[model samples]
Target: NGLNVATKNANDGISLAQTAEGALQQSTNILQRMRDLSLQSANGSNSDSERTALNGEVKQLQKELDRISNTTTFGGRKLLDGSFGVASFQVGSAANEIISVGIDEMSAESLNGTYFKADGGGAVTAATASGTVDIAIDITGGSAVNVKVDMKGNETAEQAAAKIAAAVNDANVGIGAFTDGAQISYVSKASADGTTSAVSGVAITDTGSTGAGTAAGTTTFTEANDTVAKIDISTAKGAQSAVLVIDEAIKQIDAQRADLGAVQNRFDNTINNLKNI
Candidate 1:
């Protein structure tokens, strides 16, 4: 019976060790991809499209990095992900803990899912269109409205979204816009509680009508809002100053890290319990 119990215990240890090893290997595989992408980004290209291309690759790498960090494990032992857990060593009475930060995609900033390309728009003009469904923006029934528009016709949805984001942020209008899949939004810094003394001209419109489609109005803030910030069509700046497409690829590292960390924490807890046992 003692032999049987010992064998079982040995088997259990092997299983746990194997599980940890597998998780570590999976994390390593992801890191390899990250390394490749990072190298791609360091090249000197002066166009947004080049940067945009780099960004796309980076985004996927980030997700994968996050995946292995948070999801992989061996024998229920989490590894490499962003998890906070406890580990104990019984040499004397020293308690040592470890925090795993899945660093695969953390180096580059995220452009989310937006796309960038060489032929993308270079300048965003005022809403010269008048379409009702493109981007509807009507403030609280007031005249501070604008039918937003960009290179929607001339570019892909990804490109359009990027352009819109640049236009909004560049204008310094105190807002940031982003897109997730089929959805796109332009959010204002103004709070819904109406406490902020910014611009509450409730009739702000977001109809995706630009240039020729823009509705003729006298709203003070309704011009294409160029001269606001720098939302160029493509990366026309110098090659060194060019935006890297890969930069957008690895943008979701934070979310990935958070996910990995949570799982890693669980592993720590389990280790602590095992050590005490």
Candidate 2:
């Protein structure tokens, strides 16, 4: 009768220890998955809908963690709730020959607390021209704006520049024209569809005709590609902040992973010791 009791107790101890170790291993696997989801959310180019989908996965992962923490148990004693407290095993007949293991607390709140930042589009400047310039503006995926101004003998450089600007604006295209120190600066408007825009071409020339016996005046022209596209955001934030959010989230996840790794190592040692017993 005594031998039978000892054999049953030893088998039960091994079973309980195996169950605890399995739950801990599962928790590590879930933590790794959550870390990957955090990385996906950190990317800058993701659209709002895309981000929404990614966040859905995060919430689901959190729920899964919650389930694991609440439901994982060994003989009705919860293992992951941090309520398992201290577990002891009788490795031999002697009371002094016992092994113990400590379980740590883990949940979504304990693992994740980072948020992603908003972002803006990229920008580029178009080449500019000064004094009696002639240029044709071609907007990518949009209409073109052209200016061919004739500078009469009495016209000043400023007047010619103003005339060129007025001509370009009068076309009713989505470009803005301004004169700065005898230079004409062209700026492309943001897309009406809430996307990025770019300049496709800028054709500049100096082919203005003059009166007989009059010198053909020089017209300094800059390429249309030199103007900067204005980048504006109507959403949460811009690309710079997005980078910051991603970088910080990465650091936090790395720290979490380090903690998880330590726990795994401790669990490994415990499992090995339990097996020897």
Candidate 3:
């Protein structure tokens, strides 16, 4: 017999989402191990053998990650291959009793450096007492703009932030300046739908405040739409980046989990509303 929509709670409708949730969970497990290896290699307390051993595991994990993404299937449907998009599951009697699910690519080839956020270079504060501070904002992305700011040490930190932000917005074209009464950060404007944006360097050249202010640090743009394939524990720099990229990969999985969870919950409610015969 077929699934009976007899207005009674029959078999649950979380069947599809359950399989999706299971696949995502496994991916998260391996991604966690990758991060652990990344941290072990990043501490700078080992030799070539140890680093290579760790790198060995990392490469194998990358292979396995891709394997799971490519092989996991449900009803002859590849779930994580970026081919699943807006699939509607109907469970109710009404015309709109459908729940949709969309899954994107989660393979190692697509999870590296793929997720990022907009952030400022560094946060600098002004001195409470009287004096002068010199700031330099270097914008380098073709037709560069170099902005020099004169901060009178007497103004509060908020005033300093306002002044510097104003100066940065005035000088730069795509880059925008922001302040939160304490620190000033420069963030890049998105150039396209899926690409990396550049963050110019910001620095405090000199300061003559009562108490020396915290220096603004140099910053750069992060990668977007990258994968966990290039991330390995072979080098210290690569390990550092691997940590960030893997976390993003984990976050990507979590996002999928959240999406599937919602769908599962909706199905459960729909079943609960039924009268089990």
Candidate 4:
């Protein structure tokens, strides 16, 4: 009877240790997959549609991590959830030879599942203009250029937008201009202008006959706001920032896996010693 009881106890200890090991291994594997998804989201070539799909995958994987944490168990005792608390297995005949394992809950929120938001400046709007308008651009370190934009009296917004685009484009001074149906937009070839400031050198004025002449309007594009907002990988900038967050999250998971591995090693050694005894 004594031998049978000892044998059963040893079997139970080995079984429990194996279960814990499996749970830790699975957690580490999930973390690795999460890391891969994060890296994929970081790619700039991904379009908005692709990024939307990627976000869905990220959320699904996050749910799987939570599922693993919730469902992993040994002998009906939780292994990944904090509810499991501290578990001890008697691996040796001697009362002093025992091993204890600590489990912490892992969740999607804990793994940095939150998204980023963009604070970019909005499009500029031009005021209504009539008749002929005089547009001038002064390139720093370059000569000042002027364009006379002739407008029919009381033109539609689209007409004005197109005229502005044409005038700006004709200047050909390293500035790009385009007209959406509603407004005209302009941008510098360089993100930051060194030869000239974005707004300083540009001027627009009405050059029409008194009371029947042009009323000049100008639109200037503004930079995005500096504040970082919460958002998914829906935008280029957002995806870029998300990559940094994911890298940190991967580092966290790697650390957790390393700790779990060490503990598993200790359990394996203990189980081996028990068998020898």
Maximum-TM-score candidate: 3
Across 1-277, the per-residue lDDT of candidate 1 in tens digits comes to 2333333443444444345445545544554464454455534343556766755664575566556556665445454443424322222123333222333322222222222112111222333343332333334324333434445345444544454544443544433344333223333332344334233321223455434222211122221111101122222221111222223323343344455546545555545554565
- lDDT string for model 2 (1-277, tens) is 2334444455555566566556556655654564455456545467767766765664575577677768877787886666877676544444554455545554444432222111111111122333344557666576666666554545454555555555665665554444443455544433444243344444545444321111111122222111001111111122222222333334444554454455445445544554555
Candidate 1 — worst ten consecutive residues by lDDT sum?
Answer: 222-231
* Candidate 3 ranges with C-alpha deviation above 4 Å: 1-3, 6-12, 94-96, 114-225
- Clash count of each predicted structure: 64, 16, 6, 9
- RMSD in Å for model 2: 17.2
Root-mean-square deviation of each candidate, in angstroms?
Answer: 13.6, 17.2, 11.5, 12.6
Better of 1 and 4 by lDDT: 4
Error of 1 at 152 (Å): 44
Error of 1 at 181 (Å): 34
lDDT of 1 at 111: 24
lDDT of 3 by residue, 175-251 (tens): 55556555554445444453555444555544555332544434555544446888867765456557767877897
Ranked candidates (TM-score, high to low): 3, 4, 2, 1
The better candidate by lDDT, 1 or 2, is 2
- Each model's lDDT comes to 0.37, 0.46, 0.66, 0.54
Q: Count backbone clashes in candidate 3.
A: 6
How far residue 205's Cα lies from its native spot in candidate 3, in Å, is: 8.5
Name the lDDT of candidate 2: 0.46
